Structures are given as C-alpha cells and as structure tokens.
Structure 1
Amino acid sequence: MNPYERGPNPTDALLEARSGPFSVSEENVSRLSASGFGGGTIYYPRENNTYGAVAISPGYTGTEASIAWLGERIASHGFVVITIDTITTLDQPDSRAEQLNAALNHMINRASSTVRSRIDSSRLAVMGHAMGGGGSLRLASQRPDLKAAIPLTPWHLNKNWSSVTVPTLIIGADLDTIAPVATHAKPFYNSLPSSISKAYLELDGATHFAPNIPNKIIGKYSVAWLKRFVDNDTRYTQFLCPGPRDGLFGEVEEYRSTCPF
C-alpha cells in the first residue's frame, strides 16, 4: 500500500541489531571526483530498488571514518547514504551545510549508474555529527524540501532555527562538554516551530563522542525517523510516539516530541 516501504515489519530487536536486513556495497568518491566537498563513501543496498538518500557530515577536525558505522547501518535498512569528508577538517557548520548539499547532488547526478538508479531523488535527508549537525540544521533551513534532518550532538553558534520546517530529530548527549545540550541541542529544538514534526532525544551517559561509537539507541531512532519521514513508513510511528521513556527504568535521559505527526 505504501510502495516506499522496504524491509520487514520492525521490532526493537531488529532496529537495535548491528545491521539491518539489506546487504550493502560501497562506492568511493575521490576528493577530485567530488565537487563542493571532500569526497567520501556511498553506502547503498545491493538489492535493486529505489530508496531515499541521506548525506552525513562529520564534525570539527573529523573525517568520514568517525561516522562510517552510521552510514553502513542506515543503508542496511534500505537507504543510499553518503559519508562525507569536508574540504578541510576545519570548515565551519554553514560551510558543512553547503558541502552536504553538494554531496546530495553528487549522489543524484554525478555518481555511477549503480548508485543513481537506486535513488529516488525526491526523498532526501541530511544528518551530521557536532558541527555536521549544525550543518544539518542550516541545510534543512535552506532546503525545506528535504524529507528529514537528524542533527547528532549538534554544534552551532546560531541558536535560532524557526525557519526549519523539515521533520527534525535532534539527539543530544547529557555529558557532551563540547556542544552542551543547554547551549546547543535544546535551544535548537526549542526554537524550531511548535507546528512541525520534531523530537528531542537526549542520550543518558553519553559524551560528545557517542555518535562515533556503534550505539543501539542512535541507530534505532535514526532509522525510525528516516523510515517515518523519508519513506512515509507508518510502521515506524510506534517507536517515535510516545517515544523512548525518559522516566523510571527508561532508556533515555529525555524525549520530547510533537507526536502525533
């Protein structure tokens, strides 16, 4: 009925697993093949179909290796995902925004036919870690046609994101000393309009480095957000609404959403 649906009916166990049901192959994007970003890796499902497409940016001083596990894991649930390097490791968030955009266009227009034929260019998403998450917010702001945005422990000097109407899941970490949730992630979530689809999930016992370490919470709710908004897959509403519990015996420090979507 929903022809964007891919994979079997979900459970906590399948969403928390290290790998989804799709086997994954990779396309290397060399620095000189890439226009407007530093190259990276495209993870894509071997099974021929069309899928939504995600661009992910690392943070200050980092490269694609620090978010590789995430590109693999998300692709293994039926998405085409690029993990980018930036032009320099020191690029600022609003520069990372522009480079994420360039990576979306690379996947759609300049990659091999193998990749291009597997992308529904109308269903795109953006993610990023730390300054990359800042880049996520800016691009989401600039491209309200994107289907989802997921800033992970995001970092940005601009705290006002009321121009964002893309469905946005911000993931904060309670022990993050580099982008403390009080001065970044929460003000980001709070300034996003109350009228859009958004959610704030704060990890419990997690540093700035948590998105760089295979993490079953991040993987589960990142895929669920993408399934729900890139594929319009309502089989995944159950994980977002009411969402993870932040109370007694809960899995999360804090979860806040505009459920129902």
Structure 2
Amino acid sequence: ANPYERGPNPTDALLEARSGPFSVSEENVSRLSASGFGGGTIYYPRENNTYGAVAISPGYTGTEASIAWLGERIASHGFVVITIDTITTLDQPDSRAEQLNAALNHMINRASSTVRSRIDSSRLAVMGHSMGGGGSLRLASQRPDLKAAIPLTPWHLNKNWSSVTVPTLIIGADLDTIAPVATHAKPFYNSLPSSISKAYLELDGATHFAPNIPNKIIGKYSVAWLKRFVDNDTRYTQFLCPGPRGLFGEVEEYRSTCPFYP
C-alpha cells in the first residue's frame, strides 16, 4: 500500500552489513558546478526508480572524504545521497545549513538527468557531522517540509531547537570532547519538542570522530530512520521502537518518542 517502499524486507544483519542491497553509482559535482556549496559526490542506486534524497555535510576542517562511507552506505539502501564539500572547511553551522539547502537543490534541479529522474523531490532529508550536524538542525528548523534530519555528534552554539518539527535522530558520542553530549547533543535533544518524532542514540566508547569511521550502529540506525521517515516505511519501525534502550560496547543510551503514530 505504501508506494515508497524500496528494497527487500529488512533484518538486523542486512542493516549492519557494509553494503545494502542496492548497487550504487556516483556522479561528481565539481566546485564549478556547485552553486552555494563546495561540490561533492552524489551516490545513487543503479536500479531506476524514484527515491528520497539526502544531503550530508562534514564538520569543521572536514571534507567529503570524512563522510563518504556514509553517503555510499545509505545510497546502497535505496536513497540518492550527496556528500558535500563546503565553500571552505572552516564554515560555521548556519552557513552549512544554507549549503545543505543548496545541495538539495542541486540534486533536484542541476544534476544530470540520471540523478534528477531518480529523486522524488517531495521526500528530502539532511544529515551532518559536528558543525554539519548543527547545520542540519538549523535547516530543519527552517524547512518543516524535510522528512528527516540526522545530526551526528552535532555542534552548534544555539541549544534551543524547539522550533524543529522534522523527525530528528541525534547521535551523540559518550567520549566526545569537541561537541560534548552534555553541552551539545543532549541539550539539542531535550529542546526539540516532545510532540515530534525524535530519538537520541548515544554511542558507547566513541569519540567525536566516530561518524567519520565506518560504524555499523550509525549505519543501521541512520538507514532505519531515513526509511521510516523519508519512505514512510513502517517495516523499519521494529529497529527504532523500542530500540536499543546499555547495549554496552555499542549503545550507551537510547531515548525516543516511539512509536511515532503508526
């Protein structure tokens, strides 16, 4: 009944694997071609269909190489995904929000027909690492039409995200000393409205750079979140609700507003 379902029925194994079930191709976006961001790489399913589209930003000093693994992995579960470079590696979070917006527009309107035809432009999401995660929150606050936001070890000077209504999964890292969960991730999660679809997943034994290092937990829960909200795919609710709420060695804590009005 759900026209947006893609791919085989999921399992924990299928979601933890290095690659999902979709073969993936890439399209480079040069800095020349990009308007309002620094270029990047668009990963997309070889199999023709329409999919949701996702823009991912790196963090301060970061390049697309630091998030490439995640772009490719998410695309391999049935999404069109752009990992961007920013105008400069030192851009601040609200600038990164604008750049995420520009990157979404690029995929929808300026990429090749191969890419553009694979996107349902009504089903979009944003993600980012650190300041890029801050950027994701800012854009989500501005764009209630977005289907999902996933701030990864996010950093932002503004802690109050009570304006955000986009389904938001925040992933924190317990040992983060750059964007400590006590002063960034948790304040953000707690200020998001209680009324929205949201979750907080804190990684156990993780530094600030966990999102830059191929990680089965980040991969599994990012894909499950995008599936549930970008694709309305309730086959993925099972992974999120009740969710992994002291899987020690993997997940320090998990909070949510499950079950998200099934």
TM-score (norm 2): 0.98
The percent of aligned pairs where both chains have the same amino acid is 100
Sort the Cα spacing of 1:237 and 1:248 in 2 relative to 1 into closer, same or farther, 3 A.
closer
1:102-251 matched pairs, under 5 angstroms: 102-245=102-245, 247=246, 251=250
Q: Alpha-carbon deviations, 1:92-113, whole Å to 9, x = none? A: 0000000000000000000000
- What CA deviation, in whole Å up to 9, does each residue of 1:128-180 have, x standing for no partner? 00000000000000000000000000000000000000000000000110000
**Paired residue total:** 259
- Between the aligned partners of 1:251 and 1:95, the Cα distance in structure 2 is 32
Looking at structure 2, the residues matched to 194 and 98 of structure 1 have their Cα atoms a distance apart, in angstroms, of: 26
Dislocated runs of 4+, deviation >2 Å: 247-251
Tell me if structure 2 keeps the 8 A contact 1:224–1:239.
yes
In the alignment, is the contact (CA less than 8 A) between 1:153 and 1:172 conserved in 2? yes
Shift of 1:251: 3.8
Deviation at 1:248, TM superposition (A): 6.3
Does structure 2 retain, via aligned residues, the 8 Å contact 1:173–1:208? yes
What is the alpha-carbon distance in structure 1 between the residues aligned to residue 160 and residue 170 of structure 2?
14
For each residue in 1:34-69, what CA deviation from the matched residue of structure 2 results, as whole angstroms up to 9, or x when unmatched? 000000000000000000000000000110000000
Change in Cα spacing, 1:227 to 1:248, as seen in structure 2 (3 Å) is: closer
Q: Distance in 1 between matches of 2:81 and 2:247?
A: 36
Alignment deviations for residues 198-250 of structure 1 (CA, whole Å, 9 cap, x no partner): 000000000001000000000000000000000000000000000013x3658
TM-score (norm 1): 0.98
Q: Structure 2 CA distance, aligned partners of 1:249 and 1:141?
A: 33
Change over 3 Å in CA distance of 1:248–1:149 after alignment to 2: closer
For the Cα contact (< 8 Å) 1:39–1:86, is it kept in 2? yes
Q: 1:73 to 1:248 in 2, by over 3 A?
A: closer
- Helix, strand or coil: the match of 1:83? strand
- Note if contact 1:244-1:251 (Cα within 8 Å) is conserved in structure 2: no
| CA-CA distance at 1:117 after TM superposition | 0.1
Structure 1 gap ranges (5+) = none
Q: Taking structure 1 as reference, are residues 187 and 141 closer, same or farther at Cα in structure 2, changes over 3 Å only?
A: same
Contiguous gaps of at least 5 residues in structure 2:
none
Matched, 1:20 2:23: no
| Structure 2 Cα separation of the partners of residues 53 and 127 of structure 1 | 11
Change (3 A) 1:250 1:87: closer
8 Å contact 2:176–2:206 — kept in the other structure? yes
Quote the offset at 1:192 in angstroms. Answer: 0.2
1:158/1:30 CA distance change after superposition, 3 Å: same
Once the two structures are TM-superposed, the CA of residue 260 in structure 1 deviates from its matched residue by: 1.3
Checking the alignment, whether the CA contact within 8 Å between 1:244 and 1:250 is kept in structure 2 is: no
Please tell me whether the aligned partners of residues 204 and 248 of structure 2 are also in contact (alpha carbons under 8 angstroms). Answer: no
Distance in 2 separating the partners of 1:33 and 1:248: 44
Relative distance call for 1:177 and 1:249 in structure 2 (3 A) is: closer
**Kindly tell me: are residues 195 and 66 of structure 1, through their superposed partners in 2, closer, same or farther at Cα, counting changes over 3 Å?**
same
What CA distance in whole angstroms lies between the structure 1 residues aligned with 2:89 and 2:236?
35
| Aligned partner of residue 253 in structure 1, secondary structure | strand
Contact 2:205 2:250 in 1 (8 A): no
